[PDB]
Amino acid sequence: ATGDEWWAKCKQVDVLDSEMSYYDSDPGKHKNTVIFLHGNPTSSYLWRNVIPHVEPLARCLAPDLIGMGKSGKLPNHSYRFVDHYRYLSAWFDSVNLPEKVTIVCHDWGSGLGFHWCNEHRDRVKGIVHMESVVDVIESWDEWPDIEEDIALIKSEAGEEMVLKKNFFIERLLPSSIMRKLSEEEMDAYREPFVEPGESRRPTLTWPREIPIKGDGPEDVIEIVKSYNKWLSTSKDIPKLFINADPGFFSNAIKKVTKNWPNQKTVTVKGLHFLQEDSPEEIGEAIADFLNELT
């Protein structure tokens, strides 16, 4: 399935000064509702082979984060976590959601989805997360060895690799998928970023927001610190951690979340973009989680 076919199935809604594009399996329905949040450097297209397995049981929504996918681009090029949260939270308010929702999230979609849940604690039916942002990094030995990669990315050299060479799309993305994408699938990930320069800014700002205890950013640090604490006591929020083997962050998330209450773990084959290697198993697991809910 090509990008054209996927975004043909999506709609747009005005959000503050801009627009956001999103998949909606059942517009205007207050039945069981599941919202799928992608991260960097992907779009709603990441969920295309997962959502079919969930669609029969729930209205499925998959927004493109601001500056990503088919969503609008910000003239001032400022795409910090808080900028993404302003737009994403306004999107939540704009798609006729029922009172309680299930969030399925990945990577920075999980940072945003964890934060939105933490700020709307009475609206969360359940949370499925995978290769997620579950904590601040306080000791490097409990995380994959990215210290050097992050200092690089924060440097001007890293701006040149991302803005001019598209490092995140052309290198990081295929590096962390076990199979080989088709040309059509890769072109769908490329589509939002074909213009060199500032169109690729969201893919550079996202890794610069990594919460490193003592490297800032202190706004992200305390957002993550506060939703981690709440999730670590979230005894009556059903939670599914989908573990990717070998994964990337999965090993560290296993350790971080080991004693989180009310959390079931399922393991699938994948690296970081586990949706491209095991979409059927991931879909079936979310359906099982949904049926365990009802």
Numbering used by the authors: 12 to 305
Reproduce the article's own wording on this structure.
The light-producing reaction catalysed by the Renilla-type luciferase is one of the most widely used biochemical reactions in molecular and cell biology research. Here we track the role of dynamics in evolution, starting from the evolvable and thermostable ancestral protein AncHLD-RLuc which catalyses both dehalogenase and luciferase reactions. The regions encompassing the L9-α4 fragment and L14 loop are important structural elements that line the main access tunnels connecting the buried active site to the surrounding solvent. We conclude that the LUC activity benefits from conformational dynamics of the protein’s rigid scaffold to allow binding of a bulky substrate.
To verify the importance of the hotspot regions highlighted by biophysical analysis, we transplanted the sequence corresponding to the L9-α4 fragment from the modern RLuc8 enzyme into the ancestral AncHLD-RLuc. The resulting AncFT protein had lower thermal stability than the ancestral variant (with ca. 7 °C lower Tm value) but folded correctly (with a CD spectrum similar to that of AncHLD-RLuc and AncINS). Similar values of the specificity constant kcat/Km were obtained for AncFT and RLuc8, indicating comparable efficiency of substrate binding. Thus, AncFT’s lower LUC activity is due to a lower rate of the chemical transformation (i.e., the step after binding), as indicated by a 10-fold lower kcat value for AncFT compared to RLuc8. On the other hand, AncFT exhibited markedly weaker product inhibition than RLuc8. The half-life (t1/2) of AncFT bioluminescence was two orders of magnitude longer than that of RLuc8, being consistent with a significantly lower Km/Kp ratio determined for AncFT, in comparison to RLuc8. Based on MD simulations and HDX-MS experiments, we conclude that the transplantation reduced motions of the L9 loop, but increased motion of the α4-α5′ helices, making the mutant protein’s dynamics more similar to RLuc8.
